[PDB]
Amino acid sequence: TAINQAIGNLNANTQNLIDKTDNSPAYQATLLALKSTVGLWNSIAYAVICGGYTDKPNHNTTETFYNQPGQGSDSITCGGHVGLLQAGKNNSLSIEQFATLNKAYQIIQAALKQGLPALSDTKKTVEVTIKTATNDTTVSITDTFINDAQNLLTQAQTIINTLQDNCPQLKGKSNTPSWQTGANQNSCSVFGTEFSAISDMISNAQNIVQETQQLNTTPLKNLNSPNSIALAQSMLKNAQSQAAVLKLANQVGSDFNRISTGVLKNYIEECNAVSSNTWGKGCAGVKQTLTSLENSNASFSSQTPQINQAQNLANTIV
Amino acid sequence: QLTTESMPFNVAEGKEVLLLVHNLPQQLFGYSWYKGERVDGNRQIVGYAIGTQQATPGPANSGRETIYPNASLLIQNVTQNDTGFYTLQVIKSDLVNEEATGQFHVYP
């Protein structure tokens, strides 16, 4: 008996996390992980040191990645003289590693101007250019890329793993941001809790996406052990998964707060109107989305008892 | 101004020499030594990166040099080949670069 309303609740819930955007915890959490990643990179990027040799030392060659937030410039160039010293953990990124980052970066930017679609939507595509010179040589490619969470998170994951696994070193000084010394700093020391936090967010947003995925393809529509034990385990499964979602999204705000502790406390949420003058602040419109998530979480929390009932009924059949 | 200085300036064979550095900048990213009068990938003896406190030898390396953390460099058991010019490339923390050249003479 108490089913038919409980299902309506479980179903309506999915429609709302998956089709809606404005009030969706799942959506906003996902979007927050992407914005932050971008936000990270903008704040940091002008100071990461790329160019180590991987086979052999050399000061002659220098890649320029366009539409990057460097210091004076709207491009970053991966050093030539740095080329004299081996790329690796705690030193310097390789040019390759930077290129693979930049790709992932350009994709996420392109998809935000176009704007992340809803989670049920997997169709949406986006065009993205990637200009890169050498010294001379010059490559411009415009390719079509899926604009969906699933994928953009993978790009974010690409970005943060580059930083965490390689811990590049950071430029000295000589209006700068305040975490910048006159000496080199291992970016895993300085930005450790941001890397961990944004990483934790990406990684959580992924599970959101999964769970919503299976949830969406699994709508729902008597005696003692009369094969309605199924479609209770069913009902169970969905509720236990909607719970997971709401939890994870909450946790994405909580994961974000850790930064509001550490060094990019202020910078990651601020800007000046990619351009010459965007280095050193996140310039990704994070606040707006944070407060949008916080509210999604709050508003949806009113389902948290309906969901737990679903479970407790389910289990009493078993 | 960055500077180098062999000692001894003239070097007995089978013995050893030290190339001192002067005016090493305060704040470094790393630095490198080169057989030659010029900075050349394929003539690098060794590179030291601050971030990792590590010394990776380049192609030129005879496996008888030792670099130290104030940029100085030592060659032991010198051979006739070791004679010549030697060049120090230094990268500052803001990535401004600097070179200095020096030289020693071996005799049999």
Curated annotation (Swiss-Prot), chain B:
Domain of life: Eukaryota
GO biological process: angiogenesis; bile acid and bile salt transport; blood vessel development; cell adhesion; cell migration; cell-cell adhesion via plasma-membrane adhesion molecules; cellular response to insulin stimulus; common myeloid progenitor cell proliferation
Keyword Ribonucleoprotein: no
Segments of this protein annotated with the region Required for homophilic binding: 5-108
Description of what induces expression: Induced in primary T cells by activation with IL-2.
GO molecular function (one): filamin binding
Tissue/organ expression: Expressed in columnar epithelial cells of the colon (at protein level). The predominant forms expressed by T cells are those containing a long cytoplasmic domain. Expressed in granulocytes and lymphocytes. Leukocytes only express isoforms 6 and isoform 1.
Any single GO CC term annotated in Swiss-Prot or TrEMBL for this entry: transport vesicle membrane
Keyword Cytoplasm in record: no
Keywords: Cell junction, Cell membrane, Cell projection, Cytoplasmic vesicle, Disulfide bond, Glycoprotein, Immunoglobulin domain, Membrane, Phosphoprotein, Pyrrolidone carboxylic acid, Repeat, Secreted, Signal, Transmembrane, Transmembrane helix
Residue positions the entry lists as glycosylated: 70, 77, 81
Domain Ig-like V-type stretches: 1-108
Family to which the UniProt record says this protein belongs: Belongs to the immunoglobulin superfamily. CEA family.
Domain notes: Ig-like V-type domain mediates trans-homophilic cell adhesion through homodimerization and this active process is regulated by tyrosine kinase, PTPN11 and PTPN6. Ig-like C2-type and/or cytoplasmic domains mediate cis-dimer/oligomer.
Assembly and oligomerization: Monomer. Oligomer. Heterodimer. Homodimer. Cis-dimer/oligomer (via Ig-like C2-type and/or via cytoplasmic domains); induced by trans-homophilic cell adhesion through an allosteric mechanism transmitted by the Ig-like V-type domain, and is regulated by intracellular calcium and calmodulin. Interacts (via cytoplasmic domain) with calmodulin in a calcium dependent manner; reduces homophilic cell adhesion through dissociation of dimer.
Protein name: Cell adhesion molecule CEACAM1
